[PDB]
Design a protein around this ligand. Structure first.
Ligand SMILES: NC(=O)c1ccc[n+]([C@@H]2O[C@H](COP(=O)([O-])OP(=O)(O)OC[C@H]3O[C@@H](n4cnc5c(N)ncnc54)[C@H](OP(=O)(O)O)[C@@H]3O)[C@@H](O)[C@H]2O)c1
Ligand SMILES: *CC(=O)[C@]12C[C@](C(=O)OCC)(C1)C2
Length: 299
């Protein structure tokens, strides 16, 4: 099965293309190649600063008759400076305009924390701390629900929400739509077993971000661990005649997760799609889960 049924009745492709850190001048080609090779799910965000160029690729592939819109599953996210109820719709409309789309398949609250609204993505103060906004996730959620009612988005969800934050949404007085997805960091060093089990028990699909460990993340240091170079994981890959990246993508798939590896390199975009022709064993899965160290790319 290449798609997972969401609680809104739509089917979400279990493999998607990530676009954080994909330069504007390279992401159009990346999305074009991804669609050609079979990807039908693109993970986007306003803060990635490249939605226009993602949209150019989508429009070109629609024009070429490679895909139709209903075959694509386009995800974007609401940035922290737009958590005020009155700003959510405008943020969504700006993303739709940049992507050249009439609707999104899924729109996520990018992080539970609201930041001061304004012209800074990351308003900071002298202590190095973010300037927050007078917002809370329940009022922001009500504004997200309105986007579903208006037909701008087919599903709404959350990202980087912990157990208690998910529970706060689910217990929200007046709740209209449950979150369809929680998108969280997940890989062998941060396996998220409890949060995943909780979300799945509530019918919330989990998407694993940074599944390769985000080796291109800013501020990576030589002392940091590296999933792609972990010899224990290389050994599992060699056993299956696959690459380490392919093992790391297949791992979340066998946990009934969606996974969104990022690449701008055509060969790697294609390699990362070749994960439907093999199975990790039960022991492979248990062994990968045993590597958890609660180590986060995104703190
Ligand atoms: N919701 C959130 O807060 C959040 C946070 C983080 C990420 N995300 C989403 O999740 C996506 C994936 O996470 P990520 O971008 O942090 O990192 P990632 O997908 O774990 O890793 C991307 C890095 O791996 C390299 N790579 C890709 N395929 C490879 C392969 N087959 N062999 C070797 N290297 C390979 C890429 O290189 P090249 O691109 O140069 O090929 C890039 O350096 C993001 O792009 C974004 O869409 C969301
Ligand atoms: C990893 C972490 O933390 C993070 C937040 C982010 C974004 O998105 O930014 C903007 C670009 C993910 C970084």
């Amino acid at each position: 099965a290449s798609r997972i049924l969401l609680n809104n009745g739509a089917k979400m492709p279990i493999l998607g293309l990530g676009t954080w850190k994909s330069p504007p001048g390279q992401v159009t080609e990346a999305v074009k190649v991804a669609i050609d090779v079979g990807y039908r799910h693109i993970d986007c965000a306003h803060v990635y600063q490249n939605e226009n160029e993602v949209g150019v690729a989508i429009q070109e592939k629609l024009r070429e008759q490679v895909v139709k819109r209903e075959e694509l599953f386009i995800v974007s996210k609401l940035w922290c400076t737009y958590h005020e109820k009155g700003l959510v719709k405008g943020a969504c409309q700006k993303t739709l305009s940049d992507l050249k789309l009439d609707y999104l398949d899924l729109y996520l609250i990018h992080w539970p924390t609201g930041f001061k609204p304004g012209k800074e993505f990351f308003p900071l103060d002298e202590s190095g701390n973010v300037v927050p906004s007078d917002t809370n996730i329940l009022d922001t959620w009500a504004a997200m629900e309105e986007l579903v009612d208006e037909g701008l988005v087919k599903a709404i969800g959350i990202s980087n929400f912990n157990h208690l934050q998910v529970e706060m949404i689910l217990n929200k007085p007046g709740l209209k739509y449950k979150p369809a997805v929680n998108q969280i960091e997940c890989h062998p060093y941060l396996t998220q077993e409890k949060l995943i089990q909780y979300c799945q028990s509530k019918g919330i699909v989990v998407t694993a971000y940074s599944p390769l460990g985000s080796p291109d993340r800013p501020w990576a240091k030589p002392e940091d661990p590296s999933l792609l170079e972990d010899p224990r994981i290389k050994a599992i890959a060699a056993k299956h005649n696959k690459t380490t990246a392919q093992v790391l993508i297949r791992f979340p798939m066998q946990r009934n997760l969606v996974v969104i590896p990022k690449s701008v390199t055509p060969e790697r975009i294609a390699e990362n799609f070749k994960v439907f022709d093999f199975e990790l064993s039960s022991q492979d899965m248990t062994t990968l889960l045993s590597y958890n160290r609660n180590w986060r790319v995104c703190a």
